[model samples]
Target: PKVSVIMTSYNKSDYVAKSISSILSQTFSDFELFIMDDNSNEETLNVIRPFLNDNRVRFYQSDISGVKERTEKTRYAALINQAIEMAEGEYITYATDDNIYMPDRLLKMVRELDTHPEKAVIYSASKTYHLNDIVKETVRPAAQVTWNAPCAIDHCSVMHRYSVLEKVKEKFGSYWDESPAFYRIGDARFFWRVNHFYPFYPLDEELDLNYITEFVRNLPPQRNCRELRESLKKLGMG
Candidate 1:
């Protein structure tokens, strides 16, 4: 596969179908969709099951029976790591159950990566909505490449080369940081690791829609702030 889209699913039954639909509808079709699902209720499973009919969709259900719930660790990070190990794409991107990718997202991103051999990671502008109202819209009109995520890069808005994982694992022993302290900021923490090596390439176009619903937008961040800060400080990133 040219690309692998890793989607971690939990309980977003109302929105998951749209997320799956968006990927299946992408203009670029040479990609594998890894739907790594954590234990979810029947409602959510019902929405996800039908998508398995697609040949590109490879579904895996997590064994959550032995996993204990902890406020300090994020299960999603581990789940994503598992997907990373199983991924067979030249490039990898991510999708959340509450996000929708624009129709041309894959086409544009893959095109950018294919042409720019030196670029390992590429990201585009994103539109974030809260309660159906636009809350934030990230755009970089003048910047084509940056050495770091000045504000922050949305995980759903990025497409990175698969080779980066090998470099990350050689140094950190894992692809995505599954540390208990960074449950809330796992994406940012992972970005810190990647930025230590290469900068992010920017695509000056909105390529995805992220919805921060009432339940999620208002929910407290799940992490021990002090512990996460210390962990980052040890990496000299704090």
Candidate 2:
């Protein structure tokens, strides 16, 4: 079956290729890779240019520049929705530019989606690693692993039937509403809606890395769980 890998990126040149290379090396070769660039720098394009001619890669840039002012979830939701709309495949999954995926990740996901028609979402064990080459010992689900949260599904290891997403699209249309007002609950709110109707499947295998410390250590100091909690409450999803 044809599969589409959708990724949202923002100046992730240092690692995008590692992520893309993992997809390109997939045992299952029939897949399209869609990358939605969030106004990244020259380094991003430099990293992606090598794959531009690959018949399976599609790259797009957001209409605006500068990580412009917009609600967090709402903006990201729109970007993801747009990328999915551009995809034409039997299955789809999300990818992050800053992470690396196992070569079998896509193939494993395909196996799951092909066998589990009852589940709307499929996730694998998201392991956290040190640096770009070391896996730090912990493989666990973070706060957003449930089907009830919009961003709950482990994106690093996600794969599902495209038709299932289309079905939900008929109702919520592409990604669900973060409504701009929702600063954080965006992922949870959307996925929870999907959970309300369908089920989720988790694979015991490790397919991707979340790299918690590497990701959080670069934060701009004010981004904390407290701020996230308040945002969730505003969306009534706290």
Candidate 3:
């Protein structure tokens, strides 16, 4: 099965190389990697340029200006949405410049979807690392199969049928939520939309490592607590 992996990149030059290396080393080779860069600086571009030699890599840089302008909406969502419009795969997955995919991440997720045709969206567990001095780590399980309570799904650890995009667009006319209100939790908002149609299937295995950012860790309590609840309630995901 052909796979399309869409990854959003910003100024994380230090971790982007490792992130891309992990994806490029996946055991499953029949995939196209879409690197959507949000107009990162020269230092970041220098690190990402060498990867362009690979034929499977499709690189795109946004015309948007600074982060201030981009954050008026969900920045990453817009970038990923661009890739979604051009993706040419039977299955789709997401990635970030700071995450790393296990060598078998693609193979395992592909096998799960291949064997379970009834499932539309499949998600796996993830190991989260705090890049700060605390250096804390935690395993996020795919135990909550429902859309209630906390977000049980990790955006980078999910694989969904590309056909589902048609259904999503038919219903809402968009792939990911790019609204400013959802700027802090675009993935969670998208999850709400998807759960309205299909329950996310759980794989119960860690497929990727997520590095929680200072921005994420220090997000106003409102975003982590009230914003999500309000959005879910408004969307009827509550």
Candidate 4:
């Protein structure tokens, strides 16, 4: 079965190649790696160029130029939306420039969903490590992993059937919510769309290895859970 892996990269040149390499090196090779780069600087694009030689790699660069343009919609969602439109896979998954997928991530996830035909979405646990290469300590969240996803699971931790998107689009009119209000939690917004129908099933395995960074702590604050609920209510998804 064909798997479409959607990845959105910005200016994270440092870790971008490592992320791409992880995807390219997957034990399962029958996957198309769709990398949607958000018009990053030359340094990042240069690092990404060499990987395009692989036949399975499909790359796209966004021309979104200004803060106003970027702020108008959640940029990552727009990029992901484009990737979804171009994808021709039986299964759809997500990736990020900051996360390193395990070697067997796709192989196992593909099999997990394949064998369980009733499951529309499946996610594995992720282990977060310190961002520094030297510090390899794991950081577990204080809260328990919830049965419900959306807000809990990272995008990189999930794999869903392509068929689910049709139901999501019929309700929401898009693969992902592109509103700026969903800027900070785009994956969760999309998950909510899927959760409205089929619930996410869990695979009791850790398939994603991600580094923990402190960048989001320095914010004017950005959790739009309230906004998400309000939008859902307005859409009669209450």
Best by lDDT: 3
lDDT per residue as tens, model 3, 69-168: 7656677988888899999999999999999999999999999999999998989999988876647989978875655433656679799999888888
The lDDT, on a scale of 0 to 1, for candidate 3 is 0.83
Clashing residue pairs found in predicted model 3: none
* Runs off by more than 4 Å, candidate 2: 66-73, 131-136, 141-152, 181-186, 212-238
lDDT of 3 at 6: 95
Model 1 pairs whose backbones collide: none
Summarize candidate 2's per-residue lDDT along 155-203 as a digit string, tens digits. 4566767666656767775565546554345555555546545556678
Question: Roughly what TM-score does model 1 have, to 2 decimal places?
Answer: 0.84
TM-score of 2: 0.76
**Total clashes, candidate 1?**
0
User: What TM-score goes with each of the models?
Assistant: 0.84, 0.76, 0.87, 0.86
Residues 21-84 of candidate 4 have per-residue lDDT tens digits of 9999999999999999999999999999999999998999988886676677788899999999
Positional deviation of 132 in candidate 3, in angstroms?
A: 6.3
Ranking by lDDT: 3, 4, 1, 2
lDDT for model 2: 0.67
Worst 10 residues of 1 by lDDT: 65-74
Please identify model 3 stretches exceeding 4 Å from their true place. 131-135, 212-238
